[PDB]
Structures are given as C-alpha cells and as structure tokens.
Design a protein around this ligand. Structure first.
Ligand SMILES: CC(=O)N[C@@H]1[C@@H](O)[C@@H](O)[C@@H](CO)O[C@H]1O
Length: 283
C-alpha cells in the first residue's frame, strides 16, 4: 500500500523495524520511550514538512503540541515546546523496498535516531544496524480501512451521516441502526484517498457541484468529487475532518450548523468549527 507514505500532515505510529507491536510513546511531559502499541493519542505523531529545510517536525497528538527534539549537545531525545530549533527538525528518508525509514537530525545530519534494547531512544552516528531503522504506519488507515463505520457530527451525540429516505441526498439523522447510516470506508490506492459507501444502496459519498454543494450517494466514478482525505483535527486525535479531493480546501460540513433531522450535509470551505468535525466509530 501507499497509505503509509511519509506524507505531510498525516499522523503515524512510529515503530522500531524489529517490532511492529512497539511504538514511539510520549510517556511524560518530556520523555519518549518505545512501548507496547495501545493507540492512545500519546502514541500518535503528526508530520509537518518544512519545504525550505526539506525536513519535518514530528508532533505528538495528545493535545500538548510538543515535538520530537534532540537535546543537543547530549545524546538524549525528548519532546519539547516548538521553538523552531534546528534540533527539532528531522529528515525522514525511506528505503522504498524494505519500507524502513531513517530519522536523521537536521541540525546535525551525522546523527540519527536509534532505539535501544531497553526501549529507550537516543541519537547516534550511523551504523548499518536495524536499531536505526523505523517503520511508519498511518493511524487512520490502520483503524478504518475496509471497516463498516458510523459518522456522528460533533454538533450532537445522536446525529449521524445518513442517506435521506427516497433520495440520494445525504443528511443528518438520529441513530436508528439503518443501513442508510452505515458507511464502508475504503482506501483507494490510485487516488491515495478514501471512498465511503452507503450500505443501503452501495453508492458513494460524493460532492455534487452546483450552487447547493450537497453531498449525495453517487455511482462509482474516477472523478475526484468521490474521494476524501480523512484526517484527525490538527491537534485532536478524537475527532475527524474529511477534505474532498476535488478541492482540498473544502470539507464535509453540516449546513448552517443545524442539528435537526434532515439537515443538509455539504462541502464547504474549511474553517475547523464543530459543524465540520466528525466522530467516526466502527459499527
Ligand atoms: C459555523 C457554521 O455553521 N458555518 C456554516 C458553514 O460551515 C456552512 O454550513 C454554511 C452553509 O451555507 O453555513 C454556515 O453558517
């Protein structure tokens, strides 16, 4: 799959190459360690690419906004407040075939991240050894791919993404365990984004581009209007935003933040308010 590629603004588990069941874990306000995978937000990391530097910040997703930091001149690493220090940027360089990634410090590219036998991390000069190789797993792909899901608006604990009765228009409706409100989320390798298929009619969540900008269930198409970048909120891994591939500045949105059964769901410019936030759970 290409779902685990080192994309800007994607969120990952970062594992030692020798153990996919251990992940980089922010255990305290400053310390990181490899730990058994638990999928808490303190084990999730957002990549933020700096084009000028051709290097990334690696930000924990537990709400603290702290970033992976080499404690120069020492050999230790920590999470610290982002002060845009050169020691807070990392080159992420991938072996295309093995999928292993080297995490090399920007301030001193002689130094790479290394995991130790005792699960601690440090920086070190480069060897040929597996203790300096990491694998990246996209969190959302791991959790949601090929799963039957419900999508609740942040606006109301009992309002869900639902195909309307006797229409293709997609609306908010209270839960009644309907196949109209159940969506199979499937990653499409060609578009590098997701489709969401309504269980009731086997048609897909799709931006219908006219003055209304409603989403409807629509037949399978190659057009970008049917594909969605599902991401966590910038600093909250408990909520999602769905950006449409036809215009990635536009997102799945509840019309006028209304909560009434039948309220139109639309595609609208991103602003990040609660009517654009979705709680996705497995059925
Ligand atoms: C904060 C908020 O609700 N903004 C909504 C916007 O997201 C979109 O739904 C639009 C539809 O025309 O109406 C606005 O009031």
């Amino acid at each position: 799959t290409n779902a685990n590629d080192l994309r800007n603004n994607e969120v990952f588990f970062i594992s030692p190459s020798n153990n996919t069941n251990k992940v980089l874990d922010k255990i305290s306000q400053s310390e990181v360690k490899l730990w058994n995978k638990l999928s808490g937000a303190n084990q999730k990391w957002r990549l933020i690419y700096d084009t000028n530097k051709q290097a990334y910040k690696i930000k924990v997703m537990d709400n603290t906004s702290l970033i992976l930091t080499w404690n120069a001149p020492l050999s230790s690493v920590s999470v610290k407040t982002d002060t845009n220090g050169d020691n807070q940027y990392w080159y992420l360089l991938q072996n295309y075939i093995s999928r292993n990634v080297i995490i090399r410090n920007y301030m001193n590219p002689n130094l790479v991240l290394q995991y130790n036998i005792d699960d601690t991390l440090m920086v070190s000069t480069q060897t040929s050894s597996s203790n300096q190789f990491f694998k990246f797993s996209n969190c959302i792909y791991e959790a949601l791919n090929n799963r039957n899901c419900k999508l609740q608006t942040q606006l109301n604990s009992d309002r869900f993404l639902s195909k309307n009765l006797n229409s293709q228009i997609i609306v908010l409706w209270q839960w009644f365990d309907s196949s109209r409100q159940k969506w199979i989320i499937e990653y499409n390798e060609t578009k590098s984004a997701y489709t969401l298929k309504c269980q009731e009619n086997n048609r897909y969540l799709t931006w219908i581009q006219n003055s209304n900008n409603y989403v409807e269930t629509y037949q399978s198409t190659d057009s970008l209007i049917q594909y969605w970048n599902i991401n966590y909120l910038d600093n909250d891994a408990s909520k999602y935003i769905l950006y449409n591939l036809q215009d990635t500045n536009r997102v799945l949105d509840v019309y006028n933040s209304q909560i009434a059964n039948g309220t139109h769901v639309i595609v609208d410019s991103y602003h990040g308010n609660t009517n654009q936030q979705w709680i996705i759970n497995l059925i």
